[PDB]
Chain A
Amino acid sequence: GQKFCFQNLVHVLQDIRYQLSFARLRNSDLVTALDILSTGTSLRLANAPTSKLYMLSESPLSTKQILQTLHALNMLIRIRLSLYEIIPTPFQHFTIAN
């Protein structure tokens, strides 16, 4: 019975420690909460390679956007080509199309 007493005390102490973890409260992860305002876990996607490879964008594509992409793209090929190192001389005349 005396031994049982020792053990029993240890178990009660563990139990109240358990209740202890149940009673504390920790400062909010506002980051995750704000990400979930916008309905994704932005963290888990950016971080993950399998997410980013299997991620897919929202289906709307702004057609005014895609024009502006095109403009910036053409413009960027001009950038490249003007400072692209090697053009073959038969290629020396080029048109930066649409």
Chain B
Amino acid sequence: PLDSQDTGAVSASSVNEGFRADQKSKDGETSDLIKIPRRAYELRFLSRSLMLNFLELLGIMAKAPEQFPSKVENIRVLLLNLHHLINDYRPHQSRESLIMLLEKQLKHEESQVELL
């Protein structure tokens, strides 16, 4: 397309979020009594959840194979959400990589000036 692909466009999106400028959210909620960053927690959560849904899948294979479509759908949305969210992480990473590059050019510049 003219812009990148959208997760809501492909299937249902399990969560939404936004972080303020120069501030990050972390809270203490109880599954194993975690006190850690909020985006990462939603992630870990989705992952352990995926693990469990797969265990389910194995079961429904050994007990009743024709039922799998439902469960593999569970799986699919879990993976797609994992990715959409990791994607939300990237633009900052691309920006900071550009930063490090510009920093390299400056370093070459000042070093070349002093050498001259």
User: What's the nearest-Cβ distance from chain B to residue A45, in Å?
Assistant: 21
Is A61 in the interface zone, CB < 8 Å from B?
Answer: no
Contact (Cβ within 8 A) B79 A16? yes
Is A94 in the interface zone, CB < 8 Å from B?
Answer: no
Is B72 in the interface zone, CB < 8 Å from A?
Answer: yes
Contact (Cβ within 8 A) A24 B86? yes
Is A91 in the interface zone, CB < 8 Å from B?
Answer: no
Nearest A residue to B57 via CB reads A9
Is A97 in the interface zone, CB < 8 Å from B?
Answer: no
Interface residues of B (CB under 8 A from A): 4-5, 7, 10, 61, 65-66, 68-69, 72, 75-76, 79-80, 83-84, 86-87, 90, 93-94, 97-98, 101
